[PDB]
Design a binder for this molecule. Structure first.
Ligand SMILES: *CC(=O)N1CCCN(Cc2ccccc2C)CC1
Ligand SMILES: *CC(=O)N1CCCN(Cc2ccccc2C)CC1
Lengths: 304, 304
């Protein structure tokens, strides 16, 4: 019992983190097989970051200009290419600690663990969600670029995020491992405002399911609603609209708790319309939206 | 920028987790050098848990009754002893993945990372505090006993917690690695009510410092207070009393932000007396007390 913002064990990803230095710029790389993946702005000085031409900048660089350190041992770079906003460095050694892995591009609403890194050294691990505006609310200091977000299924690491950018508003933008940015963000020091940070409605409902399962039930009410009625309330409160797909995904939690999805929606509706009245749910004074139904099932079943 | 509930990278502790089976009971062990540490109630059935005599129960057990599995390879048990509420199993192999480590007994207010485990397999990692009533607010399902709490300094793991017990109220009790319970808890299925869960005042002030450093400053006011005046307010709201030691510890955060500790105390006072007025601080609608001044300095400096 008890419910916690829970990250994947970070071990398998700790074994992949390296330091990448190009001239004076240092950030983190990800060493999988005989390839090190890092943000392409490794080749920039802050003098370049206002209007960088990455193709032109990279012409000036050679395999020996990319200093890759794995602990206190240097990797020999035998090749380099630009894929979208990442560099792939070919090294002459496969990472012996390469886990089973995939690169997956996640959807907004989906959660993942970040291993925050500085000079290829892991510092901490936390749980994130891809916000509906394709930002993540991270904790990232200078030198954290190249840190990766990941999910783990038994033995298999799915890398979904590389950290690249902090918006003036202190939220975070980055790429999948093919170097494609989530949202409209570009690796350039320019005016880039985030869209509306809407609340991930299906994740709030999953979290209300988690609450019921762990004893917090004061918010359960006598009411129900319809998808259309609920969504009128959702819109007013900048909640993502709830679909029949979302309802289907909440099915197993529905089944476990014996509370119909649309009844729980009615509970959420009254919570939006009335607030918490100074009360708390799983030790939170607001509605948590960074637990997926899958996350709730996991932490309330005990998958390893 | 951004502030997250952040755990230590769990890798070094993942390499130490094993499965311990005694007859039909299975839980987690910690393999350091040629010793596996697990909760002593591994020797119990739920039939024993009402009034277990551990000395008498252990007489009936032998080295070969303690089945220790590390992945899919079995460790040979060449010895066993009871230390307080832990068993130490001597194995014929030193854990090749033993990190540098210490056993440290933490004080209430101090934070640590938990690696939640089931059948010696890590499932997730989160950040905890030893509550002033010597409970922790964990997330622990059946089979999670033996999971450990830890801190990491560069290369050195300080193990402070082994999970043993869930109180009827769904909070968690456990031992240090010498098998001594935090608080008055005993590994027995008996009436055990937790004391007052007071708020860790120095950790709230550290968190307010973190907020200021990350841009959230609406709660800064024109007032100051005294240690004695503040503590009258602390008592009323079941906040731990603030000492000159707490003020000394907040010194570096004070220095960085240019806000005097007693001014910030006055900010906290008005927050207690007036609440948040439906506002938030670092994305929280209540006062977070599970970040130590040391945690704030770390996440706002970037230690690895
Ligand atoms: C993430 C990190 O290590 N750094 C801090 C922020 C990114 N920065 C480069 C930069 C600056 C402005 C706009 C875009 C980018 C990519 C330096 C490294
Ligand atoms: C933690 C774990 O794996 N288990 C669930 C709770 C502990 N339990 C044994 C028990 C039961 C009641 C009171 C005390 C104790 C130690 C079984 C294993």
């Amino acid at each position: 019992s008890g419910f916690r913002k829970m990250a994947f064990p970070s071990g398998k990803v700790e074994g992949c983190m390296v330091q990448v230095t190009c001239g004076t710029t240092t950030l983190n790389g990800l060493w999988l097989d005989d390839v090190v993946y890092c943000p392409r702005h490794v080749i920039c000085t802050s003098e370049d970051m206002l209007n960088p031409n990455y193709e032109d900048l990279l012409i000036r660089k050679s395999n020996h200009n990319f200093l890759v350190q794995a602990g206190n041992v240097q990797l020999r770079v035998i090749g380099h290419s630009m894929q979208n906003c990442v560099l792939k460095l070919k090294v002459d050694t496969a990472n012996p600690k390469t886990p089973k892995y995939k690169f997956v591009r996640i959807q907004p609403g989906q959660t993942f663990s970040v291993l925050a890194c500085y000079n290829g050294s892991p510092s901490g691990v936390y749980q994130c969600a891809m916000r509906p505006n394709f930002t993540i609310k991270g904790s990232f200091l200078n030198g954290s670029c190249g840190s990766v977000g990941f999910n783990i299924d038994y033995d298999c690491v799915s890398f979904c995020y590389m950290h690249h950018m902090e918006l003036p508003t202190g939220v975070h933008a980055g790429t999948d491992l093919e170097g494609n940015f989530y949202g409209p963000f570009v690796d350039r020091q320019t005016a880039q405002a985030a869209g509306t940070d809407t609340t991930i409605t299906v994740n709030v409902l999953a979290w209300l399911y988690a609450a019921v399962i762990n004893g917090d039930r004061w918010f359960l009410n006598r009411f129900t609603t319809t998808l259309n009625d609920f969504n009128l309330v959702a819109m007013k409160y900048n909640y993502e609209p709830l679909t029949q797909d979302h309802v289907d995904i909440l099915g197993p939690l529905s089944a476990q708790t014996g509370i119909a999805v649309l009844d729980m929606c009615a509970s959420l509706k009254e919570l939006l319309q009335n607030g918490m009245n100074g009360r708390t749910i799983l030790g939170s004074a607001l509605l948590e939206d960074e637990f997926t139904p899958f996350d709730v099932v996991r932490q309330c079943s005990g998958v390893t």
